[PDB]
Amino acid sequence: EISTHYVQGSHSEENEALLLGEDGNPVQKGDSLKVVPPIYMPHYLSNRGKNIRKPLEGLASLLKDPRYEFLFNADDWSVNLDGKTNKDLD
Amino acid sequence: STYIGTVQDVNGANIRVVLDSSLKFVDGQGYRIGQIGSFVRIPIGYINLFGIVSQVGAGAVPDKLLEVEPYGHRWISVQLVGEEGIKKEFERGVSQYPTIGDKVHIVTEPDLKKIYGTQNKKYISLGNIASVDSIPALVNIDTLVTRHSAVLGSTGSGKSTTVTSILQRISDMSQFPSARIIVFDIHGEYAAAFKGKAKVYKVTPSNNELKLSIPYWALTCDEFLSVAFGGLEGSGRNALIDKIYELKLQTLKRQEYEGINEDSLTVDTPIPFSIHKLWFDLYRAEISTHYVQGSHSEENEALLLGEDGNPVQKGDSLKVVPPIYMPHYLSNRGKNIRKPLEGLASLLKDPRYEFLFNADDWSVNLDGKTNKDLDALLETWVGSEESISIFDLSGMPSSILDTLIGILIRILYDSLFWSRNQPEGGRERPLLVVLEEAHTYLGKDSRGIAIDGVRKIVKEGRKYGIGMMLVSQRPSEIDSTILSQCGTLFALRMNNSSDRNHVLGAVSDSFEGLMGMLPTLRTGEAIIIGESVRLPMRTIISPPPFGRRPDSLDPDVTAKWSNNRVQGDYKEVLTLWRQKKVRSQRIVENIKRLPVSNILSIGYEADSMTLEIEFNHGLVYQYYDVPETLHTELLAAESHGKFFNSQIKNNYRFSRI
Amino acid sequence: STYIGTVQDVNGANIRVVLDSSLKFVDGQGYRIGQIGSFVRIPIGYINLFGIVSQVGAGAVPDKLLEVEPYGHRWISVQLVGEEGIKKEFERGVSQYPTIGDKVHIVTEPDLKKIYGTQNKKYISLGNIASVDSIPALVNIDTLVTRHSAVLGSTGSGKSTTVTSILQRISDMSQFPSARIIVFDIHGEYAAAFKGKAKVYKVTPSNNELKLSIPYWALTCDEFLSVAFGGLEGSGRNALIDKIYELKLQTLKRQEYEGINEDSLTVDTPIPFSIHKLWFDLYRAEISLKVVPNIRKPLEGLASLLKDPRYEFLFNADDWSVNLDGKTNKDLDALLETWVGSEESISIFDLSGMPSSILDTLIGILIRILYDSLFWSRNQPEGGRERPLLVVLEEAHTYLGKDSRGIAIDGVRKIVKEGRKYGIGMMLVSQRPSEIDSTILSQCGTLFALRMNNSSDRNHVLGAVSDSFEGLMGMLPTLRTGEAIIIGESVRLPMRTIISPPPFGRRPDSLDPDVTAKWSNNRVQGDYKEVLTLWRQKKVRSNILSIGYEADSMTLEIEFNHGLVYQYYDVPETLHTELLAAESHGKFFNSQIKNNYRFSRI
């Protein structure tokens, strides 16, 4: 929903022209587990985003708030990136 | 004697009684036979069952006997309230009901004292009872603070004086040396009651009264949008949010904050950032012009060079004068938010919004460095030396009052939530909040932000020790769900037929004896109903001493329209209006003021030919073109309110400070 | 015969009584022993418990007794209202309620004085009380002004005369030599009430009357665009704003103003700038005194406005007309001084001769000029803190609609919400209360209820009154003409007064053309060519107290009441001297002179 397509008319992730630090590594790689959203260098704008900017901002806020640790980061049922859980509902 | 008769009926939890002979008066004071509110006694074996009257006359006769005789208007109806154990205490709930023919005796002073008195240490007197002289009304502070209350009544019943009495009682340094209170004034009528035992914050400061400051960078992004741009929705909102975020990152870059990093920085976090820089850099896009077509770089600014080649209008960011570029390629980089940015510029101009965008010490320079942090702000608001902190919201613009209430409540609640384990939280030094005129912000379908915060406090405030005290003269307008969650009520005089019913519709202990006398309680009376008291009372709140009363310094037209007209020059009014400032240009820098309506100090000056005088309530006037010979004559005459009131009162052009 | 009966029921706030005997219509004046709203009193021991008659008849008997006595009704219901002190004062609320079998008396003249009279200096007289003799209705003045007012009723109720009475009694030079009041007269009738005691501003002034001029540069950007163009929203708006800014900066460079420089200059700033140059410069790019030469249509619209006698109070102000060089004879100082600083207290901006389309946006503007001017000088001796102001608004239900999207609603709401601090009042004369926004009518302090026929508006009034007392509000649709029920916090208790009508000859009357008079008189042939020669160029050019004299133009001149000037043409001067010597005014002129010769009013 917030991406930069380097090639006009293309929206594939290969066209991800995010701004990268002059050191060589990306300035903001970002991580899935953390709620840090990657930044991208100014531009085209990916065409596969819907109008759910604000709802996803709200969900990010909820995920970053410790008061919901009981729901989104369950102690032993926390789900990894690959869909795994130490203990089932059993 | 006290034996008034015997009960001639019973229906389980209700009974009736007959008269005593004509009226009988006992002890000679001013009182009467058992009235509507009065209590009675019923001895049984070893214990006593206490009752309360319901109504006197044809409203209590048994149906069929009245059918037999129509003139038999000789009965009253009394309802059982409780019992006294075996010399243990008054424990509500009767263990053994009465029967026909048994005795019934009037209630004397010692028995009433036993009913109302109490051995627990957590009670305190917040008024006095009306039926008998000198009986404290033992209200429970614990419950009153941890379960919320609400003061109601018509305009003249005296809500402000009641709240003043309660707050003075709670914050006595002899009993509670570590209280903590906050007040919201919509007319600023408490800053006079607490003369020297509180802090007062105002939009327009005074000689010894602090200035209210709410730095814009303490707000959330959403509330900032609400109060600055009037709630943007389009992509302008996204552009604005990204700008705020980037500026906050820039601030954090050059300043070190503990445990906050680019991996944990969110928009709503309270970190300083520049607003003047925000407006300048956003607007510059909307009117940027590049010296070369097809370019959008700042170095291409097509500025109209002057005689020396330097641009005539360089502009400036700290002040809000934007520059002018050459006519027109205009850069197509900015969004379509020109109108919101013009509105923001206008807001920055106004001296009415200084408390947001130009806080006295929390104002931020261009690179973000702030002279003081928020810890001092919180320390002043709630950790000060004196307990009660008073906010004067009279001077705020009327269109952002609701949002301000919401912002302040949110800040207080969040600050006291996250530090609930330290000795500075809400569970170690509990807090109370007072809201003045709560019917205009808690409406049934109010769309504002205040109702959200008030609901959150009413609903979660029991765990983190945050109370609430609602003041309102129109209970029918307060949201019913909120009004039902207030533990205690102080029902004062209530006039119209709608609010009376709406109050009865949310009172747990609807009590027939006392709720029927609602519309004629005197100025000061207050029927306190709820869990904070064992049994409902009817207490006359003890008035605060004179001088310590709430008052608002509004003009009195009859005393002002009467003064003989003095020729006025309207060049001054137009000058003030155009300049956008309330201070004239002919005031002296200062004058030494020596001690003696009344006059408490008179100054003087020879060079400027000016006189300065002070009155009660910190009213300072400066009169002009008054020879100091008149000064010495005034001093000598020992008039102090007559020579001034008769000689120079209406003969010289003057000005308040 | 100070006696009625014995209270038989006591509900704490609703006692009942059993009348004992015969009702006599006391002659001379007509006051009966007991009415529906008549007060009652009950001596208890040493103090007095006063009440009001709530219901009379079968509606007051205790309920179940109806079963006992189906057709026996002699009971009354009295709601006890307040109490008297121990020779101290009357205060509301009751120290101790009555019991059964007490005594119930009737209110006597000393009690009339105790309840109704008072000693505070604020209170004044606004008409005596009804149903009793010689008791002035005392209305607190401070509270009435600073806590806002309102008038409601039916079309023929007579609210204009009540407002005239209040204004007359609130500005007399005897006690209030420095009063100040403003009236937004619309229909244009008050101007006849205050002949030589108030300032009146019209659009077509007479020989001894002023001209209302509102300079077009005293407006903000939004207001000016709204009035002129209707509120453009495209790039044309940006172009016009920039042009206004450029003109103002230019004039400031031309002429100096106290403490204003390029650094503190805005569009909102009230400084002169020439409209004609703006129009001419913005039109040249798409192709002065005379208007001969993608915002084209806007510029034809404004061009049409320039040469239109209807808009002569904006663009061709009498002396606020601005030269090409932004130069004016007078600044806003004179305007403010005339509007609010004149030697006469009350001023009337009768807006009858206004294009109704803009009327709303006109009202707001004035309310914004005054407040904004009395706010930034609240410490000087010319602000609202030192000589407060009262604003009147006639026919408020059209502009303060619940859903109206005009600008007047904003200004009135702001005065109601924020006028307490700076001493600004408000007086809403209305005719259909249910129309007015319920959020604003609930902030008005005092209410002068009058006759109300609609049942759909009485309910609104009853539901939006601070002290919904029923003894005085069950009689709304039967009050007399001028009988007013005063309820609010500006009075100690509800009042039911009659307003002392203003003396004859001092009353409001919009000079409508009486069809009977203009259709009874005999037909006289018309000179329609005069009508055309007068329309092409778009221009207008009983008792007798004087007669003009001239024997050279063959003309006669007469003056009637109300300052009506009539010129009769083609009148031989022999008949002129005949009439002058006849000493027959109202009869000879009636005889053969009303409808014989041509005449054109001037």
Ligand SMILES: Nc1ncnc2c1ncn2[C@@H]1O[C@H](COP(=O)(O)OP(=O)(O)OP(O)(O)=S)[C@@H](O)[C@H]1O
């Ligand atoms: N114990 C009291 N005894 C007698 N009069 C009181 C008492 N307390 C307050 N008042 C009266 O009320 C005046 C002060 O204004 P209050 O009526 O107390 O405030 P309030 O009107 O109840 O609150 P608002 O204005 O509706 S927010 C005082 O000057 C008294 O006339």
Ligand SMILES: Nc1ncnc2c1ncn2[C@@H]1O[C@H](COP(=O)(O)OP(=O)(O)OP(O)(O)=S)[C@@H](O)[C@H]1O
């Ligand atoms: N107190 C009064 N007593 C007797 N007649 C009155 C009184 N007040 C007004 N009138 C007369 O009743 C008629 C109408 O009253 P007005 O107040 O002049 O008009 P109005 O209809 O009330 O004003 P509008 O059209 O509703 S804004 C007139 O003949 C008045 O002279």
Ligand SMILES: [Mg+2]
């Ligand atoms: Mg108050």
Ligand SMILES: [Mg+2]
């Ligand atoms: Mg009228």
